[PDB]
Structures are given as structure tokens and as C-alpha cells.
């Protein structure tokens, strides 16, 4: 066989220039009027997947 | 003799009897289990 991508991980991480993975932050979909604008403004840019989790991500995304 | 010995070792391989150990051996294991409860 040929390795299948964990497909719902491809919709959530995207590869960068030096091999790290970017992802959208959690907590910014609903319940929102209770949150400060400082939280929400700091959750909008995309973020790098941390060191702990790259193992999991590279396992799920073997072609990206 | 060898054929009769293989089949007559094969006698109690698919048994059901619960009061007899291994299908055939008489015991008191009903009273032992029953008294343990």
C-alpha cells in the first residue's frame, strides 16, 4: 500500500518553510461576546504547532 | 491398535458434563463450589 493521509488533519495544519506546521487557534468559533477583544485579537493569527505535538502531526500528515 | 488408540484418546474432547471433571471423572466439586459461595 501507499500511506493514507489522516484527512481531517490536512484540513487543520499547513506545512511551513522550515518544516513546522501552522494551525488556526482554537476558542474562536462561538461563544464570543463574553470574551475580551484582547483574547480574540490574539487568537486570530495562525500559530506554529509546538514541539510536543509535531510527532503526532508528522505521523498524520506523511505527504505534507 | 494405533488407530484405536488415537480415536480412544479422542473420546472426551467435545464433552458437556459438568458434575464430572473432564467429562468422566467423578468428584465432589459441586459441593465444593456450592459451599464456597
Amino acid at each position: 500500500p501507499k500511506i493514507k493521509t489522516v484527512r481531517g488533519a490536512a484540513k487543520r495544519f499547513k506545512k511551513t518553510g522550515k518544516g513546522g506546521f501552522k494551525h488556526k487557534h482554537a476558542n474562536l468559533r462561538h461563544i464570543l461576546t463574553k470574551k475580551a477583544t484582547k483574547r480574540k485579537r490574539h487568537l486570530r493569527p495562525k500559530a506554529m504547532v509546538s514541539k510536543g505535538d509535531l510527532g503526532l502531526v508528522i505521523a498524520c500528515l506523511p505527504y505534507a | 491398535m494405533d488407530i484405536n488408540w488415537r480415536h480412544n484418546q479422542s473420546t472426551f474432547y467435545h464433552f458437556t458434563s459438568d458434575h464430572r471433571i473432564s467429562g468422566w471423572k467423578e468428584t465432589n466439586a459441586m459441593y465444593v463450589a456450592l459451599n464456597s459461595q
Binding site: 489522516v6 481531517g8 488533519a9 484540513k11 487543520r12 495544519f13 499547513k14 494551525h23 488556526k24 487557534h25 482554537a26 474562536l28 468559533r29 495562525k46 504547532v49 505535538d53 503526532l56 502531526v57 505521523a59 498524520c60 | -
Partner: protein, 143 residues
């Protein structure tokens, strides 16, 4: 001399053989510890499985869409276009030089190093820095 040929030094590494003896290092448990799901034949959990905690690829939101149009755009360096056989660059003349691909409809002439010959670029988008680099080394860009 077929019994004097010999491989390099370091090329043929041995190969772990598990389950043979005490001296070998990997006997009884073969290097897989005591009981558990991981010491079992077939045993192991699936990918992105954190016990039952919601996995990383599933507690983070999904973003974006796929373009359809970025799969037919390309990106031409300046190291090529001395490779086009002609000194004239269109989408064909690049396809013919095995440099973009047949499905490609759009192309772009990024500064990525060292054009020398005078090249006439036709119908391709050219970046700013590479417009200066094509026009500086003779060259011509029309569209």
C-alpha cells in the same frame, strides 16, 4: 576476483533479530517491554490517538480552501530560461523544455538567480526584481 570484492565499511548493518537468547540483548520480549497493548502482536494504537483525549487534529479548527487555480500556476526561476532553446519565453517554449508541465496555464518569472543571455519574455507575469534582472542582462519583456 569475485571472492575478493567486498562492500564499503559501514554500508551493511546487521539487522535486529529479536527473540534469540539472553546474550543478544533482544531476547524474551524482543525489546518491547512487559505486557500492555503495545507488547502485543498487532498491538498499537492508531495515528493521532492520545488515550481518549480529543486529538490535536480534531480539537483545532479547520481553515481555508483549495484554490483550483494554484494547481495550474507555475513559478519559473531565472536559472532556467537559458534552457528554453530560442531566447523567447511563452507558456509553450517552457512546456517544450520540460520545465512547467502540460496542465499549466499561468507562469511567473521570479528572481531566483542569474539570467545571462538576452531573453524575450512573452505573455508571462514577471516580478519586479526579475524584470530588472531580465532587462539588465540585455533582455526584453512584453505582454
Amino acid at each position: 576476483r569475485l571472492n575478493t570484492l567486498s562492500p564499503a565499511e559501514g554500508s551493511k548493518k546487521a539487522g535486529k533479530r529479536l527473540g534469540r537468547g539472553i546474550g543478544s540483548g533482544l531476547g524474551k520480549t524482543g525489546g518491547r517491554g512487559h505486557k500492555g497493548q503495545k507488547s502485543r502482536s498487532g498491538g498499537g494504537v492508531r495515528r493521532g490517538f492520545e488515550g481518549g483525549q480529543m486529538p490535536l487534529y480534531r480539537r483545532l479548527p479547520k481553515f481555508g480552501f483549495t484554490s483550483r487555480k494554484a494547481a495550474i500556476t507555475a513559478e519559473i526561476r531565472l536559472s532556467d530560461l537559458a534552457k528554453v532553446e530560442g531566447g523567447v519565453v511563452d507558456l509553450n517554449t517552457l512546456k517544450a523544455a520540460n520545465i512547467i508541465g502540460i496542465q499549466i496555464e499561468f507562469a511567473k518569472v521570479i528572481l531566483a538567480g542569474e539570467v545571462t543571455t538576452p531573453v524575450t519574455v512573452r505573455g508571462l507575469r514577471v516580478t519586479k526584481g526579475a524584470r530588472a534582472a531580465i532587462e539588465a542582462a540585455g533582455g526584453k519583456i512584453e505582454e
